[PDB]
Amino acid sequence: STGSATTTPIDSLDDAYITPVQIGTPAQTLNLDFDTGSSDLWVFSSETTASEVDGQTIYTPSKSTTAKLLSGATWSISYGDGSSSSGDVYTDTVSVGGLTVTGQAVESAKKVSSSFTEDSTIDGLLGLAFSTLNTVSPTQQKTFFDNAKASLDSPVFTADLGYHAPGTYNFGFIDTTAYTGSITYTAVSTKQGFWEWTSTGYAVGSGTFKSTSIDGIADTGTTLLYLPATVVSAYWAQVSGAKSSSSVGGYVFPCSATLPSFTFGVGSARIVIPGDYIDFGPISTGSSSCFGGIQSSAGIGINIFGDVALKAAFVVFNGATTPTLGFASK
Numbered sequence: 087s088t089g090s091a092t093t094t095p096i097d098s099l100d101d102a103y104i105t106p107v108q109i110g111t112p113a114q115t116l117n118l119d120f121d122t123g124s125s126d127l128w129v130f131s132s133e134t135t136a137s138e139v140d141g142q143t144i145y146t147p148s149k150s151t152t153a154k155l156l157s158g159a160t161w162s163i164s165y166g167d168g169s170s171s172s173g174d175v176y177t178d179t180v181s182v183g184g185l186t187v188t189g190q191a192v193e194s195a196k197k198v199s200s201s202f203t204e205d206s207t208i209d210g211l212l213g214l215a216f217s218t219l220n221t222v223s224p225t226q227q228k229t230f231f232d233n234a235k236a237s238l239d240s241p242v243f244t245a246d247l248g249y250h251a252p253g254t255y256n257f258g259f260i261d262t263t264a265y266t267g268s269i270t271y272t273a274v275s276t277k278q279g280f281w282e283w284t285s286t287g288y289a290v291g292s293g294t295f296k297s298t299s300i301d302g303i304a305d306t307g308t309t310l311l312y313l314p315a316t317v318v319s320a321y322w323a324q325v326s327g328a329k330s331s332s333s334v335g336g337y338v339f340p341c342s343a344t345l346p347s348f349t350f351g352v353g354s355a356r357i358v359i360p361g362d363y364i365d366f367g368p369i370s371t372g373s374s375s376c377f378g379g380i381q382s383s384a385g386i387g388i389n390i391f392g393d394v395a396l397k398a399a400f401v402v403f404n405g406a407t408t409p410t411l412g413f414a415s416k
């Protein structure tokens with residue numbers, strides 16, 4: 087089997103991407119944030135504290151004839167950015183882009199943190215990291231991809247995120263028309279439950295490529311590109327007037343600037359992020375100071391190849407017995 091679904095930016099800055107997901111019988115379609123940095127499929131629901139719901143579409147398991155409460159199971163997730171959610175668990179039928187899993191654990195939120203409430207466009211998350219990170223207790227549950235894997239034509243999914251435009255998540259096949267050149271595959275460590283890999287270096291604009299190992303995670307659920315402070319300083323030094331602002335929370339730059347590209351290495355291959363992908367717009371409405379899309383990972387503890395990087399590539403998440411990651415230009 088295969089599936090293919092369009093993923094759409096939630097706003098004009100590509101702050102996140104939503105993909106429609108069918109849950110239950112009859113289907114309830116929710117727009118979920120596909121997140122290769124976490125492993126829980128959780129949704130706003132009929133069980134979510136009413137004051138914590140503000141415009142999201144909810145899943146109501148009592149209206150799904152295929153839903154079954156997973157007796158005694160709860161979940162609770164604390165994301166690296168400080169957001170959180172928790173609740174109860176159902177099993178139900180879940181379909182993405184024509185690919186159907188029966189008995190998928192659908193984690194229903196009883197509580198969500200304010201950042202989730204305040205984002206009316208995101209009805210929940212669909213985790214695509216490794217199932218070892220799933221938070222359901224006392225019986226850990228499998229991700230949608232893990233449940234689908236054996237049925238798929240090939241045990242892979244691909245992320246093709248658009249810049250200020252829709253893109254595609256495919257399951258079970260590689261669309262050879264969706265990229266240029268070849269796909270370069272690179273080793274993955276699953277020891278922390280993430281799609282962790284090692285970039286071979288970087289360049290800023292038309293500058294020389296610096297060969298240096300940069301360990302990090304491929305994370306569709308993180309908006310920005312978070313890299314070591316040395317790398318980030320070298321990038322922003324090429325933007326006149328750019329500075330790290332403690333009050334704003336990172337590098338900002340004059341909105342009048344034209345930004346240089348940023349290149350990262352995948353083996354001997356090179357993925358070029360155009361400068362415009364690094365512009366996240368005014369820090370507050372009407373300001374002429376703009377927020378940068380490349381930021382230091384120093385406060386995070388891990389480097390994160392988030393959407394800013396991934397949207398410059400066609401990315402293969404290869405879930406074979408020994409997982410690997412593939413990157414192609416597009």
Ligand SMILES: Nc1ccc(OCc2cn([C@@H]3CNC[C@H]3O)nn2)cc1
Pocket residue numbers: 121123124165166167168169211307308386
């Ligand atoms: N600035 C920053 C960014 C990332 C970070 O940690 C990783 C992380 C990623 N996410 C996703 C977005 N919110 C829920 C998740 O899907 N949450 N935490 C810590 C600080």
Ligand SMILES: Nc1ccc(OCc2cn([C@@H]3CNC[C@H]3O)nn2)cc1
Pocket residue numbers: 091092093248251252253254
């Ligand atoms: N699943 C999926 C994702 C994205 C997609 O297409 C995006 C796109 C839009 N455009 C042009 C913009 N104005 C004239 C258009 O032709 N080109 N590509 C098609 C299917």
